Every structure is written in C-alpha cells, then in structure tokens.
Amino acid sequence: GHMNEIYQKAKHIKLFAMDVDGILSDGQIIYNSEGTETKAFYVQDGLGLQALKQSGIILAIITGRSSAMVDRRAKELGISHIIQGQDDKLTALVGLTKKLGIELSHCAYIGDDLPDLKAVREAGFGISVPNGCEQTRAVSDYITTKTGGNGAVREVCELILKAQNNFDAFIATFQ
C-alpha cells in the first residue's frame, strides 16, 4: 500500500550509500588461527550496483569496521567513496553531501543495525533488511524481501531503477 510513496522517495536518488556487514554480507565475521579475517559478498549484488552506477548514481560505503576485503570489493565495483572505521553513519553521509554537492533528500542509505538508524531515518530514501534490528527497520521507507548477502542490495538497486524509469532499459541491454 506504500509503493508510490516509496517510488517518490527513490525517484530522486542521486547517491546510494550502504553499510557493509549485514547488508553486503549476511553479517558473518570470520577469523582464523593465523590472524586472517574473511568476508563474503554476493555476485548478484555486484551487477545491481553496476546498474545503478550506469544510470549515473554515485555509490558509497559507510562502515564501522575496517578491512582490505571491503576495499577490494569496493574497487572492483567502482565504489570510490569508501568510509571505514566510522560508526556515526549520519555524520559521514552528511559529510558526503557537502563533498559531492548532493542534497541529503537525494541520498539513499541502507543499513541493518542501530549505528545505521539515524542515517536510514534522515536520508531521502532509507532502507533496511529482514534481519535488521527492529528500530532501524521502523525508521526505514523500504525493507527488502531478500536478506543481506543474499540479494537485498540487488533488490533495492532494481527498485531504485524502477522508480527512475531506468530498469526496463537496463534489462533490455541484456536481451
């Protein structure tokens, strides 16, 4: 019943910012006996992000943790705004608005836990996921059907493209 409300918020998005753990991954933090840390991403999310970028949308990562894995994933996907070691997601997002000349109302943010709440609440289009905390889900404009690390990002990428009448055009390039 909220589809066109969601569409109106997504239609004006010029910047798409994302949390990592629980969004681009299923939230697993993986350590081994040699001190090495591991993180897993989802292939379909990659193509979804490529689609947004192709449509002219600026991509950003804002995470409280810091790893080479995030740097590597961001670089291969052409995400050039990689903010790590930053729990205060909203201040980081506002920082980007000033850096890039994009209004906050034209920014999307997807997050899963409490550090993401304010950014999800205050962004033009705030998104969460089924396994997100209840409080961040409560302030979201949209909650994905697919879970983090299992297509949540791909799903909201398609949603934004649809709201901007760019989805069918993108699909047609593969047909």
| Residues found near a copy of itself in the complex (CB under 8 A) | 21-22, 27-44, 46-47, 67-69, 72-73, 112-115, 117-118, 131, 133, 135, 149, 151, 171, 173-175
Q: Which is nearer to Mg ion, 39 or 106 (CB)?
A: 39
Is the CB of residue 113 less than 8 Å from the CB of residue 136? yes
Q: How far is the CB of 11 from Mg ion (least distance, A)?
A: 26
User: Among residues 10, 13, 18, 22, which is the contact residue for Mg ion, using CB under 5 A?
Assistant: 22
23-45 exposure pattern, b = at least 16 Cβ within 10 A, e = fewer: bbbbbeeeeeeeeeeebebbeeb
126 binds Mg ion (CB under 5 A): no
Q: Cα(20)–Cα(26) distance, rounded to whole angstroms?
A: 9
DSSP 8-state assignment for residue 61: E
Name the residue whose CB lies closest to Mg ion: 22
CA atoms of 62 and 39, how far apart (whole Å): 16
Whichever of 46 and 95 has its CB closer to a copy of itself, that residue is 46
Shortest distance, position 47 Cβ to a copy of itself, whole Å: 6
First-to-final CA distance of the chain: 32
- Told to check if 45 binds Mg ion by CB under 5 A, we report no
When asked if residue 21 is in the footprint of Mg ion (CB under 5 A), the reply is yes
The radius of gyration computed from the CA coordinates of the chain, to the nearest angstrom, equals 15
Binding residues for Mg ion, per CB under 5 A? 19, 21-22, 112-113
